[PDB]
Design a protein around this motif. Structure first.
Motif: not given
Lengths: 408, 17
Positions: A142-149
């Motif tokens: 999974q790439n973009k995880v930091d800008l997630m709930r």
């Protein structure tokens, strides 16, 4: 540090402006050349990576840097494996390069972003392709995880799990890692050590080489006579090369454009080898090496010869014009934005048949139920059976239908 | 197989700015 080169190939897949190049950068240290004269020949990306052991909770393993300082131990790292990365873009127009990359690959890494669209057919298509081309070593990332709930990511993971079980890939590990903030790659490294083994490779079998990229060594600054030979970036699957052998590009070329052609394929001897950073002697297969042969700097420059087979003097393979293919069809189409059903084969229509790495046009003449006879326009060679993916046209651009094998 | 992932997730949750 010892100069032992590449042993096994690992690849990266995704979408444009998503996050593959960034991931590669995070993994490696020295920045890549790819993305007219420099690098521009094929959409494929080539980058390297390091596997260094430092074993002297559970998740901590190793650091990419040459000297580790972040965990605690100041000791010198053990040399186990050196690896080469092949970066392939998932653009809707160009996929031949990706296909070529797949043929050399023995490990596949899926990368999809978090804060965008969830159900995408392209990814599924890619997965299917991976399954087809002799692979079970599949790692989901999974790439973009930091800008997630806090729970959305979990839900997504669950959904993914639900989706992927009834496939060729059985026990696939799923790891969430950040590329923009530089964290959690240790787990990935550990997994790389754990799950992926090395298949047996020996000197016995006759050499097979595939050249994807082409390079010229001409840069402004110096005077008139400051020339170097043409460099051809060729990746090897099986067959060990040493310095002192004739390398040939198989299909051949036109000599005059009236007048009959009988000229043999282009032969060239190795001048200077380029591996990892500089020069080496032995060529251990399982990596992309920029072999600098006696091929012209004027010839290898642009889109002329992308993804072609390379042989050596002593052993002779065979070149075909009429190809024989046994086909297997799928239920419903892959890689279409809504899903459409597959029609049966119709006579007299232009279709693209991809055998191993080459992207060639083929015309359908006679099909009973299992066997298919096709007519070629651009030259192609045949060795054993090869990894074959078929592509048909209905609307606008190319679409996948199923998998194929050569019967002889 | 669903065992070595939760720990990783927890670790990720822990290490943030």
């Amino acid at each position: 540090i010892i100069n032992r080169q590449a042993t096994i190939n690992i690849g990266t897949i995704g979408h444009v402006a998503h996050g593959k190049s960034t991931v590669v950068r995070a993994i490696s240290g020295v920045q890549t050349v790819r993305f007219l004269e420099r690098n521009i020949t094929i959409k494929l990306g080539y980058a390297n990576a390091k596997i260094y052991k430092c074993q002297e909770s559970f998740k901590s393993d190793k650091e990419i840097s040459p000297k580790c300082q972040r965990p605690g131990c100041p000791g010198r790292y053990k040399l186990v494996r050196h690896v080469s990365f092949v970066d392939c873009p998932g653009h809707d127009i160009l996929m031949s390069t990706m296909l070529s990359g797949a043929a050399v690959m023995d490990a596949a890494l899926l990368l999809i972003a978090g804060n965008e669209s969830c159900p995408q057919p392209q990814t599924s298509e890619h997965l299917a392709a991976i399954e087809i081309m002799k692979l079970k070593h599949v790692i989901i990332l999974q790439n973009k995880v930091d800008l997630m709930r806090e729970e959305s990511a979990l839900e997504h993971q669950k959904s993914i799990l639900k989706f992927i079980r009834g496939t060729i890939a059985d026990g696939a590990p799923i790891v969430p890692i950040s590329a923009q903030l530089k964290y959690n790659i240790d787990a990935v490294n550990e997994f790389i050590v754990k799950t992926i083994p090395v298949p047996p490779r020996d000197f016995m079998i006759s050499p097979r080489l595939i050249v994807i990229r082409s390079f010229d060594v001409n840069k402004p600054g110096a005077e008139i006579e400051d020339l170097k030979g043409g460099v051809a970036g060729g990746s090897i699957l099986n067959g060990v090369f040493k310095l002192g052998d004739e390398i040939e590009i198989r299909p051949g070329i036109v000599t005059k454009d009236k007048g009959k052609i009988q000229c043999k394929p282009i032969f060239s001897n190795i001048v200077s080898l380029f591996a990892e950073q500089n020069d080496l002697k032995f060529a251990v297969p399982g990596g992309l090496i920029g072999v600098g042969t006696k091929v012209d700097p004027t010839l290898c420059r642009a889109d002329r010869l992308v993804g072609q087979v390379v042989g050596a003097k002593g052993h002779l393979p065979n070149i075909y014009t009429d190809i024989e293919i046994n086909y297997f069809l799928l239920r419903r189409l892959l890689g279409v934005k809504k899903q459409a059903k597959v029609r049966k084969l119709e006579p007299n229509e232009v279709l693209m048949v991809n055998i191993g790495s080459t992207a060639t046009g083929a015309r359908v003449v006679a099909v009973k139920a299992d066997m298919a006879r096709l007519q070629l326009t651009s030259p192609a060679c045949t060795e054993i059976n090869e990894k074959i993916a078929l592509s048909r046209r209905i609307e606008k651009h190319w679409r996948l239908i199923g998998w194929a094998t050569i019967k002889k | 197989v669903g065992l070595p992932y939760s720990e990783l997730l927890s670790r990720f949750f822990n290490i943030l700015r």
